[PDB]
Symmetry: C3
């Protein structure tokens, strides 16, 4: 999958790397994909450029908040549930980010909807599985 993060400015480069490493690990373990299946962007925002409330659930938000949008081929409900739990556990333990500050939206596509390089559709050619 592709992991796109929206965060506020204020982290050091190492803290941003840490966040990305922690999240990548959670994804690999929840999804069972290769360790080098790593595709991640970070967009940093000024105050004002995100409004992230809680739908009345009683979260907890700060300027440390992390919004993650994932584009992925179909995963089981169990894999998605586990990814969410692994993600917040990693970001808490590794980065000191409260689980109240993590929000994830996932969108799905399929085999023909990826090219990782060279103009090839690797899920279609079978270079990747599949």
């Amino acid at each position: 999958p592709l992991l796109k993060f929206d965060l506020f400015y204020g982290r050091t480069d190492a803290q941003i790397k840490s966040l990305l490493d922690a999240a990548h690990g959670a994804m690999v373990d929840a999804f069972g994909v290769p360790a080098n299946d790593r595709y991640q962007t970070v967009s940093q925002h000024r105050p004002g450029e995100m409004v992230l409330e809680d739908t009345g659930l009683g979260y907890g938000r700060s300027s440390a908040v992390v919004l993650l949008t994932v584009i992925s081929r179909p995963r089981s409900e169990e894999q998605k549930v586990c990814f969410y739990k692994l993600l917040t556990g990693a970001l808490e333990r590794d980065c000191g980010i409260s689980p109240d500050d993590v929000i994830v939206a996932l969108v799905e596509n399929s085999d023909a909807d990826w090219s990782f390089g060279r103009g090839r559709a690797e899920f279609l050619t079978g270079d990747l599985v599949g």
Copy 2:
């Protein structure tokens, strides 16, 4: 849903917050979700960073152009059609943005594809909806 706006730089902070409030209102009006079901991001762009034409329709575009991308569980065609009209209505009235300067694309997902907090899938657990 999650509302992601791409706009050009130039608005003041209060003008940005107006676009966000106007759009959020429209969304609540069209979709009937809780008022605090508010998830929005804004990416501001230098000249050059968007090219947005009109497929020959005759719109009107300026530096005020707003591109909105929505991630949402399925809504009806009716709800979508109403959203678009509500959205440009509110942006015109509240923000002075011509409806010519508004573009929307929506993509859909499912109950399992959201986590609003704490690693929980609240549509799956039944905490929402």
Copy 3:
């Protein structure tokens, strides 16, 4: 469709425009859409802000790496395969970007999920086919 690019900072305005023009052409060639069906954004990143490996495929990426996200109504598998090829071809010829530096992910939607202007759902009204 809508084409959203994530790239690293460092290109001149002309190089950004070259990259968009190139990508646009390849899209129009693959998909058979009007030349003015042009909707593109670019988000530029500091080093650190993208990590793009290769799943062991043996691709040699550089800082020129382009990540493209496409939102589109359904196209045939052939058209998608053709787009990826034409896109890399064009980015290499027109921009000097290695095909190893081009990544694409596509997400689909449908007729009711687009508003190009005026809060009109043009695929639904028939303004566009």
